[PDB]
Design a binder for this molecule. Sequence first.
Ligand code: 0VC
Ligand code: 0VC
Ligand code: 0VC
Lengths: 211, 211, 210, 208, 211
Amino acid sequence: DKLHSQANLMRLKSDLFNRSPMYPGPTKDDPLTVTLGFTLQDIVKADSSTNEVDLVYYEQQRWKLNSLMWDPNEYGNITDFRTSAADIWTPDITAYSSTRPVQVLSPQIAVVTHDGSVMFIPAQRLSFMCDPTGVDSEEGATCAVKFGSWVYSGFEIDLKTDTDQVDLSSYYASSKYEILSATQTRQVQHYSCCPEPYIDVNLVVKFRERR
Amino acid sequence: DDDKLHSQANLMRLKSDLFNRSYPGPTKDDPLTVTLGFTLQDIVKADSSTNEVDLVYYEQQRWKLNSLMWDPNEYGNITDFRTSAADIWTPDITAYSSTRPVQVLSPQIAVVTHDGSVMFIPAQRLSFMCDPTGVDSEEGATCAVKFGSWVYSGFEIDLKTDTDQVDLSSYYASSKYEILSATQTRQVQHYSCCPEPYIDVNLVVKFRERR
Amino acid sequence: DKLHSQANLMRLKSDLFNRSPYPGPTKDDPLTVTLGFTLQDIVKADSSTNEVDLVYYEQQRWKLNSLMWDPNEYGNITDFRTSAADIWTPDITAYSSTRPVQVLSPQIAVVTHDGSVMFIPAQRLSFMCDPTGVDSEEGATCAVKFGSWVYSGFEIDLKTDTDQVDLSSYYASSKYEILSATQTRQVQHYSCCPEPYIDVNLVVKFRERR
Amino acid sequence: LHSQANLMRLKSDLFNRSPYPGPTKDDPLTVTLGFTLQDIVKADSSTNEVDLVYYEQQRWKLNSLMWDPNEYGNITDFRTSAADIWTPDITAYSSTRPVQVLSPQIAVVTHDGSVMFIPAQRLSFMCDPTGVDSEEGATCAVKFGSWVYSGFEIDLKTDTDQVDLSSYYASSKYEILSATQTRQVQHYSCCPEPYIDVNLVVKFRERR
Amino acid sequence: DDKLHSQANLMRLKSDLFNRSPYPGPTKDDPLTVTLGFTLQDIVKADSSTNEVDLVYYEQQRWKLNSLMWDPNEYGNITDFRTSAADIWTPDITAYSSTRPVQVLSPQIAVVTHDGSVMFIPAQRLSFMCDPTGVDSEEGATCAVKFGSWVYSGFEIDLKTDTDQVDLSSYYASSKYEILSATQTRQVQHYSCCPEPYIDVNLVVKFRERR
Ligand SMILES: COCC[C@H]1C[C@@H]1c1cncc(OC[C@@H]2CCN2)c1
Ligand SMILES: COCC[C@H]1C[C@@H]1c1cncc(OC[C@@H]2CCN2)c1
Ligand SMILES: COCC[C@H]1C[C@@H]1c1cncc(OC[C@@H]2CCN2)c1
């Protein structure tokens, strides 16, 4: 019973990976939209001697490829599967003002659904450039970090968020810092030199010491 | 001498018949129960400037796969074997509020038995979010961390405990912290990414400065 | 449509990586590498060990005949992105780091049909630097050289497009403000050897933002 | 000087052409262990961790590693990467960080099938150094044994119960008053069979 | 524009040399001479609370294998080439009193000449055992660390130097510590048990705080 559904996975993965492409990333002819959302878990540390703040968050990434589509009927009605994030193409989304390599906190496993969409939610600790003056005041501190593609312009990779409100429903209730607000905003930058636009998601967090 | 080279051939054979001839993980059609217990060894450090605590513990994981069964009679009466944890599927049990990558302290080897059950007991050091306020009081501090599949919902991986008492038999007797109580309890929850409920085992520890 | 433009890229890459007879520069085939620095932040200055930590991007550019193609053969593709591991890259090294350099950005190169490669890794580097005077008006001064580790000026030459370090994305709220930053090609002669070595020297003058 | 070709053939015969799946109940293994303490680098009294630098001498013997030297131009032993052969999963039971390796990981295999493997390491382990700043010093223990094999598959022995102190760093912050290594038979709550360790007990104090 | 033939020759040479098959390292019947020299760049730290000192230096290693020889006439007059150090045998030269794993500061690439000689110069940071007592006086502190093969006696690896003077021509002029002297001395020792000679190079450095 269970054997057969396992052999259909094996054929599906073989068709998709071994007998096919492999996907060389997006182009201007075939652009890709990548949806980003943040779930801020903690501001672990705000260092006023080096102006670095450390955040822990889950970063949800979603995109869709024609090359990852299948008909569930040809594969015993399997509609999705888990795969190592290293066994598929993934987007090169990066913080633009990190000061330390990102530390990955969760397994590197993505889920592929039959419509060709991919879900990947890496949990991470990020140090990034930020001046925390005002954390010990009523109004608090403000920090900002952009995320986007390192090498693709808005012509190959478009970014989007589902909402501009950072998910705060798992924010650690006993953090050294209380969150005043956290937004995530798609921003487009144009240059008079260059025909191609650049997209980033801007993460802005205002916070203060838990009084 | 004769019998020894014999059962070595039998073991090598079995291991060949099991791996080189075929498990892609659980699915809604073929779900898996994993049992989780914790053995707490030491609360090493409590940092109240960042609210992080560092624990050393091991984590007993047990599950059972039909594809890992054999009749001992076909294999020179072999009933179990040790194998590297990279040779088989293992569950993606993740701490949900770690602040740094988990550090592995023990060899990554599991023990497989003829009934297809697997026993895997990695020892680890983990930093996680924990306000240690009260730790210098009779009543002490209370902190909690949850452990669950990152990418499989309760439809795919069920988690259970064998007892809800954390094993204290190896708790370091001269730790800076003594343990008032430690419990491990199954919980459920939705996450904003996903409709399905996800299972976790919540580890709650009340601890106090020794003496 | 999608079928074809994508299949062309796949074919172009297959042709370059699976099908071509580049093992690095030789004396009979030297390479010039253009280097440019963008300084993002001076993170830390430790006057107890004389180490300073910089976050910066390092723009590297070179050009190879073996990466040329005619776009007309490949559906008018003019360039592509690829993993830096798929291609030869040069061993440009800081000569006075005190810790392994930490890579902050993806490792991905852009390759153009004229065969030119561009590669811009962001990095955090701890290097040898006495920050004495960082708390005064005149500021502190430090220097670090970058060049190939194993290739002499007969195999790898370096140039800069400019001697001014790009300060246009320097972190405005850094602990340290930049007084000036220059990048200058140098040649060193030796410690025996007829063949010289080439580096790009980065000189940064800085002080506490007060 | 056909000895190079001979060593390549030997290694090729043992490793490439042959498959040792580790010890079993029907084929148990005895590992001899001995410790050489090089330096107590650090003692942290705010966390109760102590950092030791030491060698862990490991020796065992396999039939599947025997050869006749005469068949191989009289080669009696050779060195090879530890990753080419099976090695025992000897683990400290009370480390607080991953063990860091200080030396190459190269084993010496001898024609009788005996293997000697002596890696150098730095270990942080659980230890209260209270009394380190007094005449009688502090005492701490850490045991080492197979993580996943019981006494029925891996047994341990020592050649002496004296930890070798003859390379101990003479200008260390701490001096050693004693250091012993002793085989133990233990039953853990996890598991029904006995597991063997060697227990290293070290008494030490601040130098002068 | 027949750089192409020079490239073809280089690729053909590397393939003939490597994409061959069986060097098992040295033996008593086949000893290898290895020449060692240090270029001391900086004493970065001297920790008198743990008696560890950290140095940054270049370690030059030279040896020669018959199996790496070729006739340049056969390979478009190529007389040397660069290659990843992972592609060749390298000697197991080690600090005998380090307290942390060495950190590699430079690419790991060797230069191979047609007479079979290899030149390999890794830059490194080393923590080693060292009492920095008197660093704050005119006489200074002294520390010493031996380097040698981990598993090979002087009958298999003959370790040599070209000079006993450490190269200080690159020493950091603004270091916290100024170098009074730095020597590298080959020593040949015999022991109780064993008939084999053992060779080490003793690096002795005398240093003091910059005035
Ligand atoms: C089944 O369709 C929804 C896709 C979600 C399964 C994939 C997923 C991937 N990575 C992380 C996920 O997180 C679920 C909970 C939140 C942390 N673990 C879910
Ligand atoms: C005298 O030796 C001749 C061969 C040298 C080319 C090979 C070499 C290998 N690795 C590092 C090298 O350093 C050159 C300069 C010093 C740092 N860059 C040279
Ligand atoms: C109920 O479990 C019995 C099976 C045990 C063999 C498997 C095992 C796996 N991993 C670690 C083990 O630890 C035994 C001792 C405690 C630390 N080493 C045992």
